[PDB]
Amino acid sequence: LQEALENAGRLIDRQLQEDRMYPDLSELLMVSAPNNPTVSGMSDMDYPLQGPGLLSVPNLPEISSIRRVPLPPELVEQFGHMQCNCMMGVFPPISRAWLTIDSDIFMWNYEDGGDLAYFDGLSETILAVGLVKPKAGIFQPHVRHLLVLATPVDIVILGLSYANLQSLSGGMQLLPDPLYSLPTDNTYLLTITSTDNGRIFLAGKDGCLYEVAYQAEAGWFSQRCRKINHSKSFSEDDPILQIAIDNSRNILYTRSEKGVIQVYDLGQDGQGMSRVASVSQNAIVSAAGNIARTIDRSVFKPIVQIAVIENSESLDCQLLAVTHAGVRLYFSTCPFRPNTLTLVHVRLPPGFSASSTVEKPSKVHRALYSKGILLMAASENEDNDILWCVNHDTFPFQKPMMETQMTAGVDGHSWALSAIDELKVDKIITPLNKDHIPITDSPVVVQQHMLPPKKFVLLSAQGSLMFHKLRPVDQLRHLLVSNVGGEEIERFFKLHQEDQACATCLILACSTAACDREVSAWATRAFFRYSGKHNGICIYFSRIMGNIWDVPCQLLESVLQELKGLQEFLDRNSQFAGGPLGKFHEAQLSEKISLQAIQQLVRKSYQALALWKLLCEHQFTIIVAELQKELQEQLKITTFKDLVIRDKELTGALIASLINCYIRDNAAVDGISLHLQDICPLLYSTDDAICSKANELLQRSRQVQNKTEKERMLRESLKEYQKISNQVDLSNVCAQYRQVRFYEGVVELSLTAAEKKDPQGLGLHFYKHGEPAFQERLNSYKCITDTLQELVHFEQMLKLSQRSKDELFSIALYNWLIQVSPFLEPHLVRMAK
């Protein structure tokens, strides 16, 4: 009820909410600080660079180069005959790769070198090509995607179907919706991004951002694509660079050639967006001159990239903006009474010069540090871009101005960049997050396994070089690997504090022993060689089990499936990392107890999944909503902390009521294995007692009828298939069988009660002794007494008691009546004389 297990549980709950106290970054950065320090300088950041083309591999990079795919030879062939349109890019929501070519669409997928799916129909140039989510009311539901294309006539939508091919990718099938068109004016349109609903908003070489509604109305007197701008900002020079949307608050952020942002909330219409004002970067720089950071140094950089910061990411901050000086500018969009915003925070890159692949002697300058645009601009060279990646530094929470460092210097021209893990958050309003509230949305460490690692496909001038935005466990385990020999063991603690350390150790060791035995060995050595090791156990199994305790059963399903996955992966790939499947003293003993806890947690997952799977298979009361009777939405109950160790007797009752229905037939032994591999705890209820039986008779009566057919079936179920029924005290059982007119149910149950309970007939001298029994069977006798009294099924029950196997079926009501037969015969006559 209340032992060290549940107590360390609430303890790790407290640590969870403590880890949660980042708040959100609006607090980690205390952006309420109106001043310049919310800006993250260079005193706070190292820039480790190792240069392109040498065997050195960075062991603390937030990203890691993985694979490179060329461009379609056919694509190159046309692109040579392409004459005006050049925008390479990747579409994360399909993982497809594209290059905006002169006019048409012959579009490929990079992972396999997918065919550049050909369409030679267009006669007017695509300034750009976009990927949009299929908006309801337009398409056949199997339409997974659509294609939006520019023409000197207009913009157009091209439906698509992305089902997986012979995940690698979902293969695309052409869909034709050619009526999408309207020629009006000479605006250029290239800024093609879209939200969850699938809004098409287009600006281009000129700043005119029209929200195209793509509509199932194939044009009749005006073609099917119409351009609708929120241009309530007349902006003579607006080579608008890009656009950016805040789905978590229905807000849009644009970067003009000057980065200029106009306010945009999704207007009251529900399909358009309402703009009222315009903010240029001049606002930000005036605020910067006022913000007490060196501003004449800040001046002047033109804004060349932006990156939304949704409210899940930061309470009030809107977006990260990146200039030609690469300066990471973080702005807010909100209504004073997103109309009014305030400038506080700007992340500066580190100060380690990007000059040498070779380590130049590292540097620390905690005084206000700053370095040249040479190291501030990623694409320092006009031909060879230097890919720069970062997420936030969790463990540096007290060092919140720190960020995760890396260096991806390459040789091609980067043109498009986004996450493919942005896809797992594409349909939803949030970007990469780790919570449903702004707090704990950043900590990759907490969700680094329940969702696949952050990966990246970075389009290059000759293809795309694929990256994986590295996890705490990724860079960690590889620093584990890196130890061979800053100090890795020392630096881990510097980031992992022997609690996050040991958690990733145990979590990492158990997880990698299936695929990388020696990474498990590294982590195990790390943790083993109020404790922080026990705190690592707490953290690990809490990130495991709060998916029942505090997160939505969604992470529950994620973790259970990935448990089965690591299990079977270790199994079938048993050829690489073997062993799990069947002074140094104190170190190994911490190690021993910890790995035993690991394997116990594994078998508990497997044991839990089967029982959990069995419980799921039974689905008792889950559908209750479908069956009504004042019960609804059982799925939420599963979400609530009740599945693992907090509901036990009601759980037993639920799985008895599931068993009574027995939707599965020829599935008893499956149940038996669970019973003999899950009822192993002896001093407990191997099967719940009373509402189990009452619940079983509900389903037993409803699922099947003994009287119409299969009556011995329900009796023998009651015995074996519904063994959870028999053992009952004075309870619901009475009414629960009262509905039955016959007495084959209650009588059968009391007979089984006599089998499992009454060893040999001392019930005789219950009274036949005299002056020392009735109790705990008076319930059944009592139930029989009222049913028959109100009855006089019953007429066919006269052959039972008369031919009862046990005399208990021959004594109770006869005594009952006669106070108001050589079994009661002595009681009477000897009681007489």
mmCIF file with all atom_site columns, N, CA and C in Angstrom, residues 105 120 161 172 187 252-253 360 365 368 406 408 449 519 557 565 568 587 616 619 636 641 651 673 740 780 795:
data_model
loop_
_atom_site.group_PDB
_atom_site.id
_atom_site.type_symbol
_atom_site.label_atom_id
_atom_site.label_alt_id
_atom_site.label_comp_id
_atom_site.label_asym_id
_atom_site.label_entity_id
_atom_site.label_seq_id
_atom_site.pdbx_PDB_ins_code
_atom_site.Cartn_x
_atom_site.Cartn_y
_atom_site.Cartn_z
_atom_site.occupancy
_atom_site.B_iso_or_equiv
_atom_site.pdbx_formal_charge
_atom_site.auth_seq_id
_atom_site.auth_comp_id
_atom_site.auth_asym_id
_atom_site.auth_atom_id
_atom_site.pdbx_PDB_model_num
ATOM 1  N N  . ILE A 1 105 ? 6.956   19.619  -63.377 1.00 0.00 ? 105 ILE A N  1
ATOM 2  C CA . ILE A 1 105 ? 7.197   18.837  -62.175 1.00 0.00 ? 105 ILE A CA 1
ATOM 3  C C  . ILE A 1 105 ? 7.544   17.413  -62.567 1.00 0.00 ? 105 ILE A C  1
ATOM 4  N N  . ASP A 1 120 ? 5.083   16.735  -67.515 1.00 0.00 ? 120 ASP A N  1
ATOM 5  C CA . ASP A 1 120 ? 5.543   17.738  -68.480 1.00 0.00 ? 120 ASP A CA 1
ATOM 6  C C  . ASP A 1 120 ? 4.462   18.734  -68.914 1.00 0.00 ? 120 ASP A C  1
ATOM 7  N N  . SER A 1 161 ? -0.889  11.014  -53.712 1.00 0.00 ? 161 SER A N  1
ATOM 8  C CA . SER A 1 161 ? -1.227  9.884   -52.854 1.00 0.00 ? 161 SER A CA 1
ATOM 9  C C  . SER A 1 161 ? 0.058   9.218   -52.378 1.00 0.00 ? 161 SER A C  1
ATOM 10 N N  . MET A 1 172 ? 4.546   7.985   -54.118 1.00 0.00 ? 172 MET A N  1
ATOM 11 C CA . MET A 1 172 ? 3.582   8.980   -54.557 1.00 0.00 ? 172 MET A CA 1
ATOM 12 C C  . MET A 1 172 ? 2.937   8.571   -55.868 1.00 0.00 ? 172 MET A C  1
ATOM 13 N N  . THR A 1 187 ? 2.494   39.798  -59.566 1.00 0.00 ? 187 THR A N  1
ATOM 14 C CA . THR A 1 187 ? 3.150   39.390  -58.331 1.00 0.00 ? 187 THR A CA 1
ATOM 15 C C  . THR A 1 187 ? 3.920   38.095  -58.537 1.00 0.00 ? 187 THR A C  1
ATOM 16 N N  . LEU A 1 252 ? 1.377   34.006  -37.868 1.00 0.00 ? 252 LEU A N  1
ATOM 17 C CA . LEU A 1 252 ? 2.285   33.913  -39.000 1.00 0.00 ? 252 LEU A CA 1
ATOM 18 C C  . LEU A 1 252 ? 3.446   34.877  -38.820 1.00 0.00 ? 252 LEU A C  1
ATOM 19 N N  . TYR A 1 253 ? 4.652   34.403  -39.120 1.00 0.00 ? 253 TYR A N  1
ATOM 20 C CA . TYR A 1 253 ? 5.852   35.222  -39.075 1.00 0.00 ? 253 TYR A CA 1
ATOM 21 C C  . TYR A 1 253 ? 6.543   35.211  -40.430 1.00 0.00 ? 253 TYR A C  1
ATOM 22 N N  . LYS A 1 360 ? 42.045  24.318  -32.479 1.00 0.00 ? 360 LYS A N  1
ATOM 23 C CA . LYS A 1 360 ? 42.888  25.314  -31.860 1.00 0.00 ? 360 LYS A CA 1
ATOM 24 C C  . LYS A 1 360 ? 42.634  25.303  -30.365 1.00 0.00 ? 360 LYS A C  1
ATOM 25 N N  . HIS A 1 365 ? 35.800  32.411  -22.115 1.00 0.00 ? 365 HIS A N  1
ATOM 26 C CA . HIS A 1 365 ? 35.765  33.834  -21.805 1.00 0.00 ? 365 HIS A CA 1
ATOM 27 C C  . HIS A 1 365 ? 34.381  34.166  -21.275 1.00 0.00 ? 365 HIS A C  1
ATOM 28 N N  . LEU A 1 368 ? 31.749  39.199  -21.146 1.00 0.00 ? 368 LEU A N  1
ATOM 29 C CA . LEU A 1 368 ? 30.867  39.320  -22.300 1.00 0.00 ? 368 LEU A CA 1
ATOM 30 C C  . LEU A 1 368 ? 31.659  39.074  -23.570 1.00 0.00 ? 368 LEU A C  1
ATOM 31 N N  . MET A 1 406 ? 28.028  22.153  -32.239 1.00 0.00 ? 406 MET A N  1
ATOM 32 C CA . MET A 1 406 ? 28.434  21.240  -33.298 1.00 0.00 ? 406 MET A CA 1
ATOM 33 C C  . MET A 1 406 ? 29.157  22.034  -34.375 1.00 0.00 ? 406 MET A C  1
ATOM 34 N N  . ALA A 1 408 ? 29.029  21.477  -38.818 1.00 0.00 ? 408 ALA A N  1
ATOM 35 C CA . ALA A 1 408 ? 28.824  20.735  -40.053 1.00 0.00 ? 408 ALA A CA 1
ATOM 36 C C  . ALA A 1 408 ? 29.289  21.610  -41.207 1.00 0.00 ? 408 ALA A C  1
ATOM 37 N N  . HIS A 1 449 ? 13.730  8.454   -26.542 1.00 0.00 ? 449 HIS A N  1
ATOM 38 C CA . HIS A 1 449 ? 13.518  7.079   -26.965 1.00 0.00 ? 449 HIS A CA 1
ATOM 39 C C  . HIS A 1 449 ? 12.079  6.769   -27.346 1.00 0.00 ? 449 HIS A C  1
ATOM 40 N N  . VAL A 1 519 ? 28.015  -0.549  -25.809 1.00 0.00 ? 519 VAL A N  1
ATOM 41 C CA . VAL A 1 519 ? 27.482  0.737   -25.367 1.00 0.00 ? 519 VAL A CA 1
ATOM 42 C C  . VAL A 1 519 ? 26.776  0.567   -24.032 1.00 0.00 ? 519 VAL A C  1
ATOM 43 N N  . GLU A 1 557 ? 1.641   3.335   -25.076 1.00 0.00 ? 557 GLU A N  1
ATOM 44 C CA . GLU A 1 557 ? 1.717   2.461   -26.237 1.00 0.00 ? 557 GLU A CA 1
ATOM 45 C C  . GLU A 1 557 ? 3.083   2.558   -26.896 1.00 0.00 ? 557 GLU A C  1
ATOM 46 N N  . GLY A 1 565 ? 9.868   -4.222  -29.372 1.00 0.00 ? 565 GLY A N  1
ATOM 47 C CA . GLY A 1 565 ? 10.772  -4.070  -30.497 1.00 0.00 ? 565 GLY A CA 1
ATOM 48 C C  . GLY A 1 565 ? 12.213  -4.361  -30.136 1.00 0.00 ? 565 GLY A C  1
ATOM 49 N N  . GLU A 1 568 ? 12.498  -8.213  -29.585 1.00 0.00 ? 568 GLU A N  1
ATOM 50 C CA . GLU A 1 568 ? 12.597  -9.021  -30.794 1.00 0.00 ? 568 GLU A CA 1
ATOM 51 C C  . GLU A 1 568 ? 13.849  -8.679  -31.595 1.00 0.00 ? 568 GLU A C  1
ATOM 52 N N  . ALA A 1 587 ? 31.342  -1.847  -6.452  1.00 0.00 ? 587 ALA A N  1
ATOM 53 C CA . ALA A 1 587 ? 30.947  -1.365  -7.770  1.00 0.00 ? 587 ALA A CA 1
ATOM 54 C C  . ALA A 1 587 ? 30.061  -2.378  -8.477  1.00 0.00 ? 587 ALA A C  1
ATOM 55 N N  . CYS A 1 616 ? -6.337  -5.819  -22.356 1.00 0.00 ? 616 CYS A N  1
ATOM 56 C CA . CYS A 1 616 ? -6.703  -5.097  -23.566 1.00 0.00 ? 616 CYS A CA 1
ATOM 57 C C  . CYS A 1 616 ? -7.556  -5.993  -24.458 1.00 0.00 ? 616 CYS A C  1
ATOM 58 N N  . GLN A 1 619 ? -10.882 -6.118  -22.995 1.00 0.00 ? 619 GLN A N  1
ATOM 59 C CA . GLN A 1 619 ? -11.494 -4.808  -23.227 1.00 0.00 ? 619 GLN A CA 1
ATOM 60 C C  . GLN A 1 619 ? -12.784 -4.644  -22.417 1.00 0.00 ? 619 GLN A C  1
ATOM 61 N N  . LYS A 1 636 ? -10.185 6.734   -21.776 1.00 0.00 ? 636 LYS A N  1
ATOM 62 C CA . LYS A 1 636 ? -9.670  7.744   -20.862 1.00 0.00 ? 636 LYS A CA 1
ATOM 63 C C  . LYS A 1 636 ? -9.229  7.099   -19.542 1.00 0.00 ? 636 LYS A C  1
ATOM 64 N N  . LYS A 1 641 ? -3.962  7.035   -14.491 1.00 0.00 ? 641 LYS A N  1
ATOM 65 C CA . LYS A 1 641 ? -3.092  6.133   -13.741 1.00 0.00 ? 641 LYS A CA 1
ATOM 66 C C  . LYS A 1 641 ? -3.850  5.023   -13.029 1.00 0.00 ? 641 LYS A C  1
ATOM 67 N N  . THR A 1 651 ? -9.177  -4.209  -11.002 1.00 0.00 ? 651 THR A N  1
ATOM 68 C CA . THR A 1 651 ? -8.546  -4.774  -12.187 1.00 0.00 ? 651 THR A CA 1
ATOM 69 C C  . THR A 1 651 ? -8.872  -6.254  -12.332 1.00 0.00 ? 651 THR A C  1
ATOM 70 N N  . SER A 1 673 ? -1.448  -19.338 -19.180 1.00 0.00 ? 673 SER A N  1
ATOM 71 C CA . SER A 1 673 ? -0.047  -18.938 -19.120 1.00 0.00 ? 673 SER A CA 1
ATOM 72 C C  . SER A 1 673 ? 0.082   -17.635 -18.341 1.00 0.00 ? 673 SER A C  1
ATOM 73 N N  . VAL A 1 740 ? -31.748 -14.571 -12.500 1.00 0.00 ? 740 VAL A N  1
ATOM 74 C CA . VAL A 1 740 ? -31.953 -15.923 -13.008 1.00 0.00 ? 740 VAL A CA 1
ATOM 75 C C  . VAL A 1 740 ? -33.085 -16.628 -12.269 1.00 0.00 ? 740 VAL A C  1
ATOM 76 N N  . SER A 1 780 ? -25.719 -17.729 0.493   1.00 0.00 ? 780 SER A N  1
ATOM 77 C CA . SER A 1 780 ? -26.345 -18.503 -0.572  1.00 0.00 ? 780 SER A CA 1
ATOM 78 C C  . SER A 1 780 ? -27.659 -19.124 -0.117  1.00 0.00 ? 780 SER A C  1
ATOM 79 N N  . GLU A 1 795 ? -39.534 -25.016 -10.443 1.00 0.00 ? 795 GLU A N  1
ATOM 80 C CA . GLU A 1 795 ? -40.198 -26.313 -10.422 1.00 0.00 ? 795 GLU A CA 1
ATOM 81 C C  . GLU A 1 795 ? -39.262 -27.411 -10.914 1.00 0.00 ? 795 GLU A C  1
#
